[PDB]
Ligand binder design. Structure first.
Ligand SMILES: O=c1ccn([C@@H]2O[C@H](COP(=O)(O)OP(=O)(O)O)[C@@H](O)[C@H]2O)c(=O)[nH]1
Ligand SMILES: O=c1ccn([C@@H]2O[C@H](COP(=O)(O)OP(=O)(O)O)[C@@H](O)[C@H]2O)c(=O)[nH]1
Ligand SMILES: O=c1ccn([C@@H]2O[C@H](COP(=O)(O)OP(=O)(O)O)[C@@H](O)[C@H]2O)c(=O)[nH]1
Ligand SMILES: [Mg+2]
Lengths: 133, 133, 133
């Protein structure tokens, strides 16, 4: 996979995603949302997309990742949308690991206006069908 | 893919997901969680599932998507579970883009009670194994 | 798939993920983040990874899942990183369903420092390219 910039790291075959780094120092105030730049640009393999999903270390710090969909055709810089959920300010240092990028396949289909057939054992059910237990 | 309702939009081949719309005007109070209706019903391809994941625009507004798993067998209406993380009220207009739907394959297996073999280079490690850097 | 522990449940072929249970009673204070133990260990199929993603029932309760990436090579105990976003304390009972585990394939590639070609119809665009509507 062709990449531009230095904000991404190789991973081993047994690891699911690639570590993303912060391109510059970022300061998030309580409840604030910013689009952390990674300084990375890439060309995803045809038929695949990239998923930005959080890491253990930063997640347990009160930070979450929003959005997270890198389109196959995207050619711009990858940004990590992060929200600070703590009641205090947080600071993400330059080149600090902030997220993961996982390469997943996506199916492309045309949407056919039709009629949904109740041909399944669940059909209508949702939102707690088997209970809490 | 057969779909019912008007709350979903075609996407181009290079895009990963389909845009989901709000079926009606929704008002989220600070810290509130509601299941935004999309008025959409669908029949996912056998062996696949649907993933509800946020978009750039709304994410950076202090809104997040919870849950997000549409089962292959689901036949009901798709709802987007959204939480308002800001300290103010937010309003999602009718037919406003609120999320993305991405079609991913899922593996089905039987769970075999057995013994995990420490046959890997990580094995036990987790939660910040290489540090912050 | 070989598994150890009792904190996971079989699923039917039409369902995308497996239900994860809390290994012990957990008490989350407002805004708190804890790594809920599941008491589960597993050996993911080669080339695949596990995704921890929330469920309907608990999501609409003000609880969210952070991180969520189980590496193919992981051999330790699976933990669910949960944040309490409400203004009150929440309690997750023992063996209560708290999340879902979905088995997804991941592509492994080497990162080739190169030059991104503006060979797509989007290329640079991102963060609200078609508007809100
Ligand atoms: O964001 C979401 C999550 C789930 N569902 C629907 O809810 C069903 C799952 O509900 P269920 O009670 O079976 O389990 P849970 O999602 O609580 O684990 C899915 O098939 C669909 C939905 O519409 N939107
Ligand atoms: O929600 C999560 C996220 C991660 N892990 C475990 O933590 C390991 C990853 O930890 P590591 O320190 O290697 O990196 P990080 O998740 O901090 O990026 C995975 O293999 C597993 C887990 O149990 N639950
Ligand atoms: O966390 C994210 C989410 C999106 N993008 C970029 O933003 C583009 C999508 O933006 P667009 O305006 O097309 O739609 P939206 O993400 O608002 O649905 C993707 O191709 C890429 C990004 O860098 N990081
Ligand atoms: Mg979340």
């Amino acid at each position: 996979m062709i990449i531009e910039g230095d904000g991404i790291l190789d991973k081993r075959s047994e690891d699911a995603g690639y570590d993303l780094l912060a391109a510059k120092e970022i300061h998030l105030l309580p409840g604030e949302v910013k689009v952390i730049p990674t300084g990375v640009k890439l060309m995803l393999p045809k038929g695949y997309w990239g998923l930005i999903i959080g890491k253990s270390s930063i997640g347990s710090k009160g930070l979450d990742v929003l959005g997270g969909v890198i389109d196959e055709g995207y050619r711009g810089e990858i940004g990590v949308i992060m929200i600070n959920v703590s009641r205090k300010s947080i600071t993400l240092m330059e080149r600090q690991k902030i997220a993961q990028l996982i390469i997943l396949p996506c199916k492309h289909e045309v949407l056919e206006q039709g009629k949904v057939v109740m041909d399944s054992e669940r059909g209508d059910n949702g939102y707690g069908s088997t209970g809490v237990f």
